[PDB]
Design a protein around this ligand. Structure first.
Ligand SMILES: CCCCCCCCCCCCCCCCCC(=O)OC[C@H](COP(=O)([O-])OCC(O)COP(=O)([O-])OC[C@@H](COC(=O)CCCCCCCCCCCCCCCCC)OC(=O)CCCCCCCCCCCCCCCCC)OC(=O)CCCCCCCCCCCCCCCCC
Ligand SMILES: CCCCCCCCCCCCCCCCCC(=O)OC[C@H](COP(=O)([O-])OCC(O)COP(=O)([O-])OC[C@@H](COC(=O)CCCCCCCCCCCCCCCCC)OC(=O)CCCCCCCCCCCCCCCCC)OC(=O)CCCCCCCCCCCCCCCCC
Ligand SMILES: CCCCCCCCCCCCCCCCCC(=O)OC[C@H](COP(=O)([O-])OCC(O)COP(=O)([O-])OC[C@@H](COC(=O)CCCCCCCCCCCCCCCCC)OC(=O)CCCCCCCCCCCCCCCCC)OC(=O)CCCCCCCCCCCCCCCCC
Ligand SMILES: CCCCCCCCCCCCCCCCCC(=O)OC[C@H](COP(=O)([O-])OCC(O)COP(=O)([O-])OC[C@@H](COC(=O)CCCCCCCCCCCCCCCCC)OC(=O)CCCCCCCCCCCCCCCCC)OC(=O)CCCCCCCCCCCCCCCCC
Ligand SMILES: CCCCCCCCCCCCCCCCCC(=O)OC[C@H](COP(=O)([O-])OCC(O)COP(=O)([O-])OC[C@@H](COC(=O)CCCCCCCCCCCCCCCCC)OC(=O)CCCCCCCCCCCCCCCCC)OC(=O)CCCCCCCCCCCCCCCCC
Ligand SMILES: CCCCCCCCCCCCCCCCCC(=O)OC[C@H](COP(=O)([O-])OCC[N+](C)(C)C)OC(=O)CCCCCCCCCCCCCCCCC
Ligand SMILES: CCCCCCCCCCCCCCCCCC(=O)OC[C@H](COP(=O)([O-])OCC[N+](C)(C)C)OC(=O)CCCCCCCCCCCCCCCCC
Lengths: 85, 78, 105, 227, 62, 103, 52, 231, 168, 96, 135
């Protein structure tokens, strides 16, 4: 135990936390702001690169019909194997 | 009945078993050098070259022991 | 290892000489060549087109080692439980007396 | 050459006249190319017309073969004059650079405008039609020559180093040819002395086996856009 | 690569080069910190913490 | 004579190095970075308590609770959230007042 | 000349960084709470009542 | 979660800036074989077979600045994590593999089908091809595992032995003044011998492990190289 | 019109509030998936056709000539038929950048156009829905902002065993 | 008022939807109790009821994300394929 | 046109900070630019004195950091847990008492796996406080 503790980074300075929802929403707002202007047509490769893959992935998530339960990604406690909630 | 039992000392046993792996590794290394001598007395002009290969062999063979040793530590420190 | 030279048209043995799982699929059995995987493998080896056997394998491994492995691990569907929580199909519908907003026009 | 404000003003002033001239040159060059292409398809060898495949011996990758995929039309003077061929070559260079710029515009929509400002500030990648006077044309040619100077030595060094590191000439005459091929321009090279290097290198790397990095250096030296 | 440089023949020569002067100072620190620990941690008046059984790292990591 | 390493400035050489010398390696690295930040950028509170602190989690002050309290206070104050709304409490305001008078 | 000046400035900057890191910078998440930050949340929404 | 931390190389970066503002020749390289792939003259390769030299040199420098200096007490190997090493090896190995695959030459994989036409294709050759395709990925995994395990085991052993030496030196040196002084002197001499032996072993093993780390990558590259003969 | 910028917020919200996904919305998404696959298939077919048409004559002769892998007889007949059909008339056979453009630009345009108009179709479908998702879509297009916790505000239907929270 | 039992033993034989809803209800009950105490004391609610509100928020996020699978042809086929009679008998036999 | 891509576009004069730069280069070059200073992959020099100087310095600053920043956390945790479970409780002690406690922690560190186990295992019948003393 004590010997194992010697293999840690020794210059940790600061830790910041952010919810996935929050920064995903902020990123989407940035993307909408930069892809909104008229001088970037929807058929341009840049616009499709920005939008199509995200749309496809979100559609795949929505279509999902799984017989098992996937525990919430951001639970308070994910260390207990016998408690998915 | 249904009991969730947690024994603590078992992590020693497993650890010891992992060390048995070294019994091969060690032996294997010896074999290499054994042949090395029989190869240096059979063509000494290549000694240096042979030595290099032996070292390569040692480094590959030793690697395996480390794997086992890692497991021991994992179980010995958990 | 060494350079590979494709065989000439005259150096390629005839299809009738190839063997399947049990035996050659000669006349009256030619259409079974499509279904016999071993016959196709032997034919590919005979024609020096061994890549048809090797390329799909390696790529598949890569595809598993790179992209599908993690997808199955993180997003795959585990085995269903014994007592299953089916959907009653009651959720989502708007309540009685609700006045939905008009659609764009 | 580096970008400058004077060149930016020059190219912004002559932007639309340059585009109109480029369009006229495009029509003329299409006519010339149509004549040449019809003649090639009609009187060309079977391998040249059918685009015979030549694969490398190591990785079996197709590339143009100098013997089979290139054909000199000895009787082209009847249909097309020398000046027309020169016009077509110049237009091909201008059209390549314009095509790359247009592709960037279509790809990035309106976000290419600042990059267009960087583009018009330098004569390296603008068409020759943007110059409406002798002095402007001279400066444009100076920019092209500067790019050639920048790119050529890398190509020459790549070729020479790879050969010298992995092979040597067979005989003394080949040795002299190879050594004299890569002399600086301040001395005059005798073509008769240097010619055997062509066969010596044909033994090493034909045009069909040219590597991608060497090709990039060559296209840089030829003022051909590479991105 | 250990190719060359000043190499003192004996202890008395460590003072013939500033770098080896710093080295011998550091060696003095290294070797002299052990006697200090012997004196400090084997002292007569050193007393174990009365509350040493209140908490230990062993129960924490377990 | 012109060389990329000697004549170009550092950002330009960086772009050239990772675009015309090692483009595949850069692509794979970016792929791996995206994967790491998509699947290995989360830590639960229990995980932090078990492993997130050098000497161990100081339960005697519970800094995680204070951090969350600051977070939620900031969100409520900035977003003008009415935490007494029935959806948060599961009961009407009048029932809440009745409960307050009871307890 | 250029590299000498650049490396001189880089050396000074690295020296300052080294001193701060190994002699002034506190380690985060201290047990006692006397030194270093315990972490905090960022990118929280602001002025979005409809979000809740 | 975003953790802000720093590597343990800042002093070494300072020394690099101080000592390499001026040019110096390099004549000793841990993995020299990346520079000499071809040994028979008149053989040449159209593939960019020297592309690995720069990455090899930088990787050697980085791993040496970390691993070799880690023998100094309290020096930290900042990157010592299993999955981080997996990421590094994944980058290098998969990048070169994708370089060979993007070539779109399927004949390059003909050698994967092991054996000759005499061997049964489905029951022998195809199973050997399966095993070889598996072995490529296993080589990647073994490379990164071998690099991680060596460092971890060596440093665990060093820490434990140092702890034992501190214990006996501090709490049993008084025996020098006692009648059992000979036992303590024997033990102390044994500990000094063990100290020197461990340090020498670690110094050799670090360099050798870097050599093998680069050798695995170069072996991946060499397995798919084809050489033409000048005529 | 750029529907993706509007629809990304809606899709993220639906994922966050997927509990209230009726079977109708699920069918809508499945139809979107099916149409995406169909668009991929047709675009790939167009790309293959353009590649085949622009292929060199020698390339076609090698590809659709002897030997025959199976040698059944139908294989040879089909290969000869295709080879004759392609080599009968004159074909523009560009190389390099030109073949890239000819083969790719039509494919990209077709795929992008089909996908964009299917996105518009999905937006209309969700507009016509009589579920909470449809109401959210209408509110999004009206006010321009996604109203989270809408299902619990307007008291969207819940299973009989989970209506206690609405009991106020 | 009464808190639901969401212990591991109770949770083991429960559907995911029921467990999530019970957790949400427990969070709401705790939040309303804390708010009632704050109102009785007269102090502001935000200065006392922030953590309980956050717990309600996180339970809402976990509760709204889960959509029980629809019972259709493919889902029923998968369930019947995995849960054969042999597997059901084996599950019954196992005491764990 | 805005920024040059060439390193030749100078931003300062050739003589800017010439003196300090020359002193810095003199410091760098005196010991390193020598025939016997042949490095192994730029990391291990041939000059002995570089080792003799840099190994002690690296150890010294690493040890200072470890003693004053890293191990201090464990020491403070032991003090807090064994003497009240709160910082104020520890501060209620005098500096001498804290010194005694910290030195006992050092003792435990030096024993580690080889010292007596009665430093943390309470023998039966011992009269000293147990784990439930403050609970
Ligand atoms: C609106 C939607 C947009 C979609 C998104 C697009 C995104 C941008 C990508 C680029 C798009 C093209 C940009 C315009 C290029 C200009 C036109 C052109 O081809 O120039 C000829 C020229 C030909 O080059 P080459 O090397 O000589 O060709 C060798 C051939 O053997 C040459 O053959 P040859 O030797 O026999 O000689 C023939 C020559 C003989 O002719 C002549 O000599 C006369 C001159 C003719 C050409 C003139 C070009 C002028 C260019 C400048 C235009 C003015 C710009 C003004 C700018 C300022 C404006 C204010 O004539 C030709 O050049 C013909 C070439 C073949 C035609 C290519 C066009 C095909 C696409 C168009 C049809 C699409 C239909 C859609 C249907 C939809 C169905 C569903 O093109 C180029 O220089 C190549 C483009 C360079 C940039 C490449 C960038 C990467 C491309 C990747 C594309 C991948 C697929 C798409 C998806 C991308 C996703 C990532
Ligand atoms: C109206 C006009 C007419 C209509 C339009 C017509 C069409 C126009 C478009 C087409 C034009 C084409 C021709 C263009 C030629 C010029 C190109 C060029 O740039 O030349 C260099 C050009 C100068 O050219 P030059 O002086 O003429 O020299 C040319 C020589 O021949 C030297 O030549 P060279 O060959 O040596 O130079 C080449 C160099 C060109 O590059 C450069 O020179 C670099 C330029 C940037 C340098 C920046 C340095 C300064 C950095 C400052 C940082 C910030 C400082 C602090 C600021 C504080 C502010 C408060 O290297 C490259 O070519 C590298 C290419 C790399 C390609 C990267 C591809 C990535 C692909 C990704 C992977 C994908 C894989 C597939 C995945 C598939 C997955 C499915 O550079 C500049 O002028 C530098 C400008 C710097 C601007 C300020 C710094 C950035 C400001 C950013 C503001 C952001 C605001 C928003 C922020 C929002 C935050 C939320
Ligand atoms: C809220 C609290 C504040 C924090 C906010 C943070 C916001 C975060 C947003 C969200 C981000 C999420 C993702 C995070 C992922 C992190 C991953 C990570 O850490 O990986 C480990 C990894 C460790 O890398 P490494 O191996 O240690 O090497 C990186 C080192 O920087 C060394 O590498 P290198 O040496 O190769 O680097 C090149 C180096 C080459 O060498 C040098 O240039 C030497 C200097 C080195 C400086 C950098 C090292 C820093 C050392 C520690 C700090 C130094 C002391 C600071 C004192 C602070 C006092 C409070 O050159 C530079 O560093 C260029 C900058 C030079 C600046 C010089 C300034 C001179 C000013 C002179 C003024 C004079 C005024 C006179 C007025 C007179 C009036 C009369 O970190 C990174 O790779 C970088 C991560 C950065 C991610 C982006 C973060 C966003 C930007 C935040 C900027 C905040 C600015 C505001 C702060 C204000 C004070 C509170
Ligand atoms: C050149 C490169 C070389 C170097 C390689 C270097 C790398 C190593 C190689 C290995 C790869 C390493 C991995 C690196 C990471 C790359 C990314 C990655 O892995 O992403 C996977 C990732 C996996 O998806 P995911 O994110 O995990 O999500 C899973 C969901 O399934 C996603 O759902 P979704 O909504 O996105 O839809 C996906 C859909 C994708 O598929 C579709 O959307 C529909 C089909 C698309 C067809 C595309 C065109 C094909 C050609 C059309 C026809 C041409 C000829 C026309 C003329 C004919 C004349 C007669 O797939 C499915 O869902 C499966 C549907 C299967 C239906 C089967 C129905 C039964 C009947 C048909 C089969 C049985 C027939 C028996 C016949 C028996 C006869 C006796 O993405 C995908 O695979 C899907 C999106 C991309 C689709 C691209 C479609 C084109 C593919 C290329 C085709 C042509 C080249 C291959 C042949 C070459 C021959 C020379
Ligand atoms: C923001 C936009 C994002 C875009 C995303 C899309 C990707 C990027 C787009 C394009 C980017 C620009 C650059 C592309 C590469 C340029 C390559 C190049 O320089 O070629 C020059 C070359 C010109 O030189 P050339 O001398 O005229 O001819 C070449 C020589 O023959 C050469 O002679 P050779 O001796 O080298 O001969 C060998 C040659 C022979 O080939 C050729 O050169 C012929 C042309 C290619 C034919 C490919 C079709 C083969 C047959 C497919 C059959 C599929 C059946 C499936 C049925 C399914 C039924 C259920 O190569 C091969 O043999 C390679 C065959 C391909 C093997 C593919 C293996 C894939 C393995 C898949 C692994 C697993 C994947 C994941 C799992 C998926 C499933 C779950 O160009 C071409 O030949 C054609 C270029 C076409 C460029 C791509 C056009 C892109 C259109 C995009 C449409 C979709 C957009 C989607 C957007 C989404 C929203 C944003
Ligand atoms: C190419 C091969 C190189 C081989 C070099 C061999 C060096 C031989 C060193 C001999 C002994 C040196 C003793 C130093 C004592 C310092 C003071 C001290 O107290 O230290 C005690 C420390 C630790 O001793 P300790 O463990 O007894 O400390 C006790 C402290 N308590 C009780 C608190 C725990 O000594 C060391 O750690 C020295 C180990 C050196 C191992 C060799 C490292 C080589 C790799 C780094 C090379 C750096 C070169 C840089 C050059 C510039 C690069 C650009
Ligand atoms: C305590 C637990 C310990 C567990 C330890 C487990 C091991 C962890 C090891 C971590 C370190 C090593 C990581 C090595 C790298 C692994 C890579 C990997 O598997 O990542 C896969 C993952 C898969 O991504 P994904 O997980 O988002 O997959 C999406 C699939 N659905 C939507 C169905 C859920 O890749 C990524 O994360 C990167 C994705 C973005 C970059 C690629 C985009 C292009 C995709 C092309 C195909 C599809 C689009 C169509 C074509 C293009 C059109 C423009």
């Amino acid at each position: 135990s004590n010997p194992a503790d010697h293999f840690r980074p020794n210059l940790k300075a600061l830790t910041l936390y952010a919810e996935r929802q929050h920064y995903v929403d902020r990123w989407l707002h940035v993307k909408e702001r930069w892809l909104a202007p008229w001088y970037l047509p929807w058929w341009s490769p840049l616009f499709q690169l920005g939008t199509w893959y995200s749309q496809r992935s979100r559609n795949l998530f929505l279509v999902e019909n799984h017989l098992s339960y996937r525990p919430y990604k951001f639970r308070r406690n994910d260390e207990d194997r016998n408690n998915p909630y | 009945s249904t009991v969730a039992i947690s024994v603590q000392g078992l992590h020693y046993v497993g650890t010891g078993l992992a060390a048995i792996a070294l019994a091969g590794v060690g032996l294997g290394i010896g074999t290499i050098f054994g042949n090395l001598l029989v190869a240096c007395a059979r063509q000494p002009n290549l000694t240096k070259m042979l030595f290099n290969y032996a070292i390569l062999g040692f480094a590959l063979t030793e690697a395996i022991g480390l794997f086992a040793l890692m497991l021991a530590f994992l179980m010995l420190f958990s | 290892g060494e350079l590979f030279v494709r065989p000439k048209l005259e150096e390629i043995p005839p299809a009738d000489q190839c063997r399947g799982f049990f035996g050659p699929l000669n006349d009256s059995l030619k259409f079974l060549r499509l279904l016999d995987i071993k016959w196709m493998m032997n034919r590919a080896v005979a024609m020096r087109r061994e890549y048809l056997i090797a390329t799909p394998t390696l790529f598949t491994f890569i595809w598993m080692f790179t992209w599908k492995g993690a997808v199955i691990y993180f997003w795959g569907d585990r085995a269903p439980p014994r007592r299953m929580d089916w959907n009653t199909e009651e959720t989502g519908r708007l309540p009685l007396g609700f006045k939905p907003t008009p659609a764009p026009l | 050459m580096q970008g400058s404000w004077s060149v930016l003003k020059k190219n912004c002033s002559n932007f639309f006249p340059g585009l109109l001239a480029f369009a006229q040159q495009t029509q003329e060059a299409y006519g010339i190319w149509l004549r040449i292409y019809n003649r090639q398809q009609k009187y060309g060898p079977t391998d040249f017309v059918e685009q015979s495949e030549t694969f490398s011996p190591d990785y079996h990758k197709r590339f143009h073969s100098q013997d089979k995929n290139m054909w000199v039309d000895k009787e082209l003077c009847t249909e097309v004059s020398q000046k027309e061929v020169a016009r077509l070559m110049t237009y091909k260079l201008d059209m390549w650079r314009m095509a790359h710029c247009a592709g960037a515009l279509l790809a990035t929509g309106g976000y290419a405008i600042p990059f267009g400002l960087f583009w018009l500030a330098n004569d390296t990648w603008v068409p020759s039609s943007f110059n409406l006077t002798g002095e402007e044309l001279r400066a444009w040619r100076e920019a092209q020559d500067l790019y050639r100077y920048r790119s050529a030595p890398s190509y020459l060094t790549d070729t020479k180093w790879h050969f010298d590191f992995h092979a040597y000439p067979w005989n003394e005459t080949q040795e002299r040819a190879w050594d004299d091929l890569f002399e600086k321009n301040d001395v005059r090279r005798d073509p008769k002395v240097v010619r055997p290097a062509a066969e010596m290198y044909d033994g090493f790397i034909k045009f069909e086996l040219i590597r991608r990095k060497s090709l990039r250096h060559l296209c840089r030296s030829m003022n051909i856009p590479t991105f | 690569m250990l190719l060359g440089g000043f190499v003192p023949r004996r202890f008395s020569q460590f003072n013939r080069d500033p770098c080896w002067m710093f080295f011998i100072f550091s060696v003095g620190f290294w070797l002299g910190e052990y006697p200090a620990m012997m004196i400090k941690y084997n002292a007569r008046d050193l007393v174990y913490d009365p509350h040493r059984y209140v908490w230990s790292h062993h129960d924490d990591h377990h | 004579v012109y060389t990329r390493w000697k004549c170009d400035r550092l950002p330009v050489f960086q772009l050239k190095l990772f675009t015309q010398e090692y483009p595949m390696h850069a692509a794979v690295g970016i792929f791996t970075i995206i994967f790491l930040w998509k699947h290995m950028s989360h830590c639960s509170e229990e995980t932090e308590r078990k492993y997130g602190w050098w000497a161990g989690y100081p339960y005697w002050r519970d800094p995680i609770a204070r951090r969350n309290e600051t977070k939620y206070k900031q969100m409520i104050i900035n977003n003008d959230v009415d935490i007494t709304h029935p959806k948060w409490t599961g009961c009407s305001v009048e029932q809440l007042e009745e409960l307050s008078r009871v307890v | 000349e250029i590299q000498s000046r650049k490396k001189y400035f880089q050396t000074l900057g690295y020296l300052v960084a080294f001193i701060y890191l190994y002699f002034l910078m506190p380690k985060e998440k201290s047990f006692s709470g006397l030194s270093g930050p315990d972490g905090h949340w960022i990118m929280l929404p602001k002025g979005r009542p409809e979000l809740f | 979660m975003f953790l802000f931390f720093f590597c343990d190389l800042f002093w070494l970066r300072l020394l690099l800036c101080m000592y390499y503002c001026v040019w110096s020749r390099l004549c000793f390289i841990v993995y020299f074989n990346c520079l000499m792939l071809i040994f028979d003259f008149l053989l040449f390769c159209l593939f960019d077979l020297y592309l690995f030299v720069g990455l090899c040199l930088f990787l050697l420098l980085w791993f040496m600045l970390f691993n070799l200096y880690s023998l100094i007490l309290y020096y930290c190997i900042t990157y010592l994590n299993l999955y981080l090493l997996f990421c590094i090896v994944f980058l290098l190995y998969i990048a070169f593999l994708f370089l060979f695959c993007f070539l779109c030459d399927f004949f390059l994989f003909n050698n994967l089908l092991v054996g000759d036409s005499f061997m049964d294709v489905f029951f022998i050759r195809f199973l050997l091809c399966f095993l070889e395709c598996f072995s490529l990925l296993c080589r990647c995994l073994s490379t990164f595992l071998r690099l991680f395990c060596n460092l971890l085991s060596s440093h665990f052993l060093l820490l434990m032995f140092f702890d034992f030496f501190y214990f006996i030196f501090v709490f049993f040196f008084y025996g020098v003044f006692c009648y059992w002084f000979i036992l303590f002197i024997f033990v102390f001499c044994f500990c000094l011998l063990f100290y020197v032996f461990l340090y020498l072993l670690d110094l050799f093993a670090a360099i050798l492990q870097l050599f093998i780390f680069c050798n695995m990558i170069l072996q991946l590259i060499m397995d798919f190289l084809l050489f033409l003969l000048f005529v | 019109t750029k529907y993706e910028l509007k629809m990304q917020y809606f899709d993220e919200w639906m994922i966050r509030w997927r509990k209230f996904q009726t079977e109708s919305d699920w069918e809508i998404e499945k139809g979107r998936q099916w149409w995406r696959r169909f668009n991929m298939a047709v675009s790939g077919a167009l790309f293959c056709g353009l590649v085949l048409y622009t292929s060199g004559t020698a390339t076609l002769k090698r590809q659709y000539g002897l030997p025959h892998f199976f040698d059944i007889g139908v294989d040879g007949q089909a290969k000869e038929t295709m080879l004759k059909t392609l080599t009968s008339r004159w074909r523009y056979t560009p190389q390099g950048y030109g073949r890239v453009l000819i083969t790719g630009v039509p494919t990209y345009i077709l795929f992008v156009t089909l996908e964009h108009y299917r996105e518009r179709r999905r937006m209309q479908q969700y507009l016509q829905q009589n579920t909470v998702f449809g109401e959210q879509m209408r509110r999004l297009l009206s006010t321009g902002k996604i109203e989270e916790y809408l299902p619990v505000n307007i008291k969207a239907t819940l299973p009989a065993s989970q209506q206690a929270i609405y009991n106020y | 008022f009464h808190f639901h039992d969401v212990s591991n033993d109770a949770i083991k034989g429960m559907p995911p939807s029921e467990a999530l809803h019970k957790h949400l209800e427990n969070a709401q009950l705790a939040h309303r109790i804390c708010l009632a105490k704050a109102l009785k004391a007269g102090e502001p609610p935000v200065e006392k009821c922030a953590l309980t509100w956050g717990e309600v928020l996180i339970r809402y996020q976990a509760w709204s994300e889960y959509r029980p699978p629809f019972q259709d042809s493919v889902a029923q086929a998968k369930y019947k394929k995995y849960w054969s009679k042999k597997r059901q008998e084996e599950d019954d036999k196992n005491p764990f | 046109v805005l920024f040059s891509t060439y390193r030749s576009s100078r931003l300062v004069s050739k003589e800017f900070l010439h003196g300090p730069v020359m002193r810095f280069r003199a410091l760098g070059e005196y010991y390193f630019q020598r025939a016997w200073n042949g490095t192994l992959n730029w990391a291990l020099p041939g000059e002995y004195r570089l080792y003799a100087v840099m190994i002690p310095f690296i150890y010294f600053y690493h040890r200072w950091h470890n003693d004053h920043t890293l191990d201090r956390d464990h020491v403070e945790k032991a003090m807090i847990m064994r003497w009240g479970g709160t910082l104020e409780d520890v501060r209620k002690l005098s500096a001498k008492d804290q010194l005694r406690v910290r030195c006992f922690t050092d003792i435990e560190k030096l024993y580690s796996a080889y010292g007596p186990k009665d430093t943390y295992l309470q023998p039966p019948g011992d009269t000293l406080p147990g784990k439930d003393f403050y609970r």
